[PDB]
Design a protein around this nucleic acid. Structure first.
Lengths: 117, 145, 56, 109, 101, 138
RNA sequence: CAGGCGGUAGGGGAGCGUUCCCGAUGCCGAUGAAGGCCGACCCGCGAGGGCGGCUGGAGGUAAGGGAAGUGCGAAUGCCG
RNA sequence: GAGUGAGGGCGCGAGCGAUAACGUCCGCGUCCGAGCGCGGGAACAACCGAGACCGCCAGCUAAGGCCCCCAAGUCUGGGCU
RNA sequence: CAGUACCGUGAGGGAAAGGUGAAAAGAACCCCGGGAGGGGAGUGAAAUAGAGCCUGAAACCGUGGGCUUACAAGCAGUCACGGCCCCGCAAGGGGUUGUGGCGUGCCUAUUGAAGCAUGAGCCGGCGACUCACGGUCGUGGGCGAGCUUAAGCCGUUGAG
């Protein structure tokens, strides 16, 4: 019984080849190089997972504080205006009802606050 | 290979280290022991050379064993005619079978036994029966007391 | 002295764009059509000045 | 349809390149002349080239001089011939010689 | 007009009868008309009142028409030879169809 | 999938300034005003905001005792020499120039920081030439 | 259903990918084995496995498990 | 059936040393190493918190924070800088 | 057509280098023409079939295409809304990237790494504990106070 090498390896590193298309230097034409990115690009793509969410998130945060200061009120305690209310929601994302048709939010001020009297 | 026996320098060398001209690095140098004509000589006994086929054929009797223990066919030397007792018996190339004929007679006869047995002496070939089915014997004694 | 790496093709065409072949020149001519360059001699138009090959 | 060849050389392929990008996008006129009358190697060759190119492409391909536009060519390289360089203390000053290649093409106007 | 509630750590809103994804949840295909609670509505043509919850004695017709599909992801450790991947991924994703409340 | 992209914005405009504007202290939340604070469609990546100025800015609210008590220095030397100048100096050298600095200290940065800055008219008018609006807020 | 889950060496569970065996006077196979370029569907957590297209030019080995000069980025390694 | 003593940072008891060193010997505690994956730490494994597969345009709080370059009152005082 | 080229002084030492096709049928002829090396045609099942011709990948090659770019700072990739050319009625699927965010790699050593502490030409391709025998704990087993025969001899295509 005899056994050698052949084609195995190339394939295992060819996977990379495909995932590497579009990269710059050797990261677009190398098995050990692109490999070494599956690490950066890889971990940073995934990892950039908490990143990507962490982004769209706080993004909401301000635009929010932004014009809420228009009607007057402001974050922190503002959120309270919700608690003293009766429940708590809006996923500050939905809080987009300021992006299109915000007077909707207007009342919301009248809301929250009013709990303090 | 009785190599050039020792060669290159050291310290410096072709950058790459070395001393032993055995260079088990190329497709022609030393390596390891993969094979070894020692195909290893392991085995067992007859205290099993028995029990095995016992239970096997029993269920292979639920298949359709039988075995005249000794049957004719004709010229016992002309292939065709032998089979003539294949049909006049009930067999035809499909579900496979085998048999033990301790006589050169049907041996120097059965010639090319595809799908079939054509034995005579004694060696035992259960396996090939696996890919087959029915069969016949030469006296219980021939099998072995 | 001595380096220790491998050349980059990027810088390849980079510093070599100024190699964009700067083609020569040429002009018309008299008699036949020996459109000669700024001061030369050719039997395609010959000429009519000193005397070289042929003209018509 | 207005074509030839440019392979089996004896020298530097990169030295040709721009020699072509020099006369690319032009017309039969343009190239044939200008360069033909432009020193520094290349010339004496690219020449015989265009002559056979459209000579048949206007033969067993029937074209038309004057209108044959200068498509372009294929800046590319070829094979080599080995020879080492002696030196101080019989060292490793080694090499060979890159020949050249590329393609020939114009069209019907 | 719009409307709003949620679906397990994921608050959503809509309009008429659209639908795309949000993992999977029991109840055979889209042969049912399932619906949970809510909280506000949509200060516009018809409303202007949220308050304490609101999902009090009020739900929302969330049609079905299932189409659950198996997606994909792709993972791997990656650090210093401690990249022990050998493990991509998928994840759930149901396809149905809303209505309203 | 809520986005927020309104498809552009086209920043605003406004005006202000006087001998009673606390230089720098103001700065901070100043730029934090341009980029696009009141701009809801505000998608941090895009560069909206406004377009504002500060006239009779020369000497504006002289802040406090920063005068002589601050050396606006960031110009690094080459052979062994850069720059200095304290308050009773810059306050002079282009008052407009001045104020610029005070903020310049912190400021933002990047292709974005750059742009949202373009529109930074100041000085000591009043009256902001090449204007085309200015809803001044006191 | 509580629980467990980072985790170098080490020490378990499998599985996977990788060349001869019978099966091979069984079976695909030139409306293609085999190489491949491509695949942005399906199956695989992965191992991979597919799975079908176009170039491709003569064979392959089923389920199964029975044998293992491989499961090789590299060592200024051998070589081209 | 395998690692194994070439550990060290911190802190404390304590001997060294010119309360000399991100040092030495131990003890021990420690966590890094082996947790160079979190976070703070301005950037910096060993100092505080906090110990890890999905999806997240999900929420609550501890370390730890609310003018700027990025998050949340230039809050309230009430003084004292 | 190697123990040759070759390197040696002796001894010595040692290379590379198989593959058109069923059949050479091996290129007729005529315009480029320095012979060279071209185009047609023909044979030709097949010239991405013709002589470093089998099939022909890979490092290294631009024709030529498409997406990018001259205020600009970076292990570079990523994740994000956006825009910017193929394909899907639609759903979208795309390719690229702007900026914004985000980003200390990789293989070997150790209280201690990313690190100018080593190695890393570059791609391919070759590469490393079986196995003999021998010792010795487990595992499906059978026999089981009982439980196991070498070296031969007939015989074995084979097997026995």
């Amino acid at each position: 019984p005899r056994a050698k090498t052949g084609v195995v390896r190339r394939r295992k590193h060819k996977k990379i080849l495909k995932l590497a298309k579009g990269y710059w230097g050797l990261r677009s034409k190398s098995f050990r190089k692109a490999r070494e990115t599956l690490f950066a690009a890889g971990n940073y793509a995934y990892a950039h997972r908490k990143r990507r969410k962490r982004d769209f998130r706080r993004l909401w945060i301000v635009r929010i504080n932004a014009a809420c200061r228009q009607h007057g009120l402001n974050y922190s305690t503002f959120i309270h205006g919700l608690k003293k209310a009766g429940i708590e929601v809006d996923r500050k994302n939905l809080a987009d009802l300021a992006v299109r048709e915000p007077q909707v939010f207007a009342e919301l001020v009248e809301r929250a606050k009013a709990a303090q009297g | 290979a009785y190599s050039g026996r020792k060669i290159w320098p050291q310290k410096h060398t072709g950058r790459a280290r070395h001393g032993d001209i055995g260079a088990p690095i190329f497709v022609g140098g030393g390596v390891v022991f993969g094979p070894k004509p020692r195909d290893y000589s392991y085995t067992l006994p007859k205290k099993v050379r028995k029990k095995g086929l016992a239970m096997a054929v029993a269920d292979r009797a639920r298949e359709g064993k039988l075995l005249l223990v000794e049957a004719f066919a004709g010229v016992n030397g002309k292939t065709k005619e032998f089979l003539a007792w294949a049909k006049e018996a009930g067999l035809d190339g499909s579900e496979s079978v085998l048999l033990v004929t301790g006589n050169e007679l049907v041996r120097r006869a059965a010639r090319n036994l595809p799908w079939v047995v054509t034995l005579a002496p004694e060696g035992l070939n259960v396996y090939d029966i696996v890919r087959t089915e029915r069969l016949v014997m030469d006296l219980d004694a021939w099998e072995v007391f | 002295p001595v380096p220790k790496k491998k050349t980059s093709k990027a810088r390849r065409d980079a510093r070599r764009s100024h190699h964009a072949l700067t083609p020569p020149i040429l002009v018309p001519c008299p008699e036949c059509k020996a459109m000669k360059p700024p001061h030369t001699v050719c039997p395609e138009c010959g000429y009519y000045a000193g005397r070289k090959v042929l003209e018509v | 349809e207005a074509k030839a060849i440019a392979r089996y050389v004896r020298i530097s392929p990169r030295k040709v390149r721009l020699v072509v990008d020099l006369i690319r996008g032009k017309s039969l006129e343009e190239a044939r002349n200008i360069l033909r009358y432009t020193n520094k190697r290349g010339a004496y060759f690219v020449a015989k080239v265009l002559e056979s190119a459209a000579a048949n492409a206007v033969n067993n391909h029937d074209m038309l001089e004057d209108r044959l536009y200068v498509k372009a060519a294929y800046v590319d390289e070829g094979p080599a011939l080995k020879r080492v360089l002696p030196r101080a203390r019989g060292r490793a000053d080694i090499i060979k010689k890159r020949t050249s290649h590329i393609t020939v093409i114009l069209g019907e106007k | 007009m719009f409307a709003i509630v949620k679906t397990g750590g994921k608050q959503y809103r809509v309009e008429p009868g659209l639908k795309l994804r949000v993992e999977k949840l029991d109840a055979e295909p889209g042969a049912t008309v399932e619906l949970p609670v809510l909280l506000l509505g949509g200060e516009k043509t018809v409303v202007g009142t949220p308050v304490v919850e609101g999902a009090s004695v009020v739900a929302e017709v969330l049609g079905h028409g299932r189409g659950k599909k198996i997606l994909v992801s792709k993972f791997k450790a990656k650090v210093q030879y401690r990249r022990k991947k050998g493990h991509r991924q998928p994840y759930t994703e149901l396809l149905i169809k809303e209505i309203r409340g | 999938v809520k986005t927020y992209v309104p498809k552009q914005v086209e920043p605003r405009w406004v005006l202000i300034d006087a001998e009673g504007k606390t230089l720098g202290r103001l700065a901070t939340k100043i730029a934090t005003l341009l980029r696009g604070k009141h701009r809801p469609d505000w998608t941090p990546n895009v560069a909206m905001g406004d377009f504002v100025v500060v006239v009779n800015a020369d000497k504006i609210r002289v802040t406090g005792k920063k005068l002589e008590q601050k050396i606006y220095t960031r110009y690094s030397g080459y052979p062994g020499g850069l720059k200095k100048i304290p308050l009773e100096k810059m306050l002079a050298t282009h008052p407009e120039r001045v104020l610029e600095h005070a903020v310049k200290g912190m400021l933002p940065k990047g292709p974005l920081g750059r742009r949202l800055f373009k529109r930074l008219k100041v000085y000591a008018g009043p009256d902001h030439p090449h204007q085309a609006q200015r809803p001044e807020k006191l």
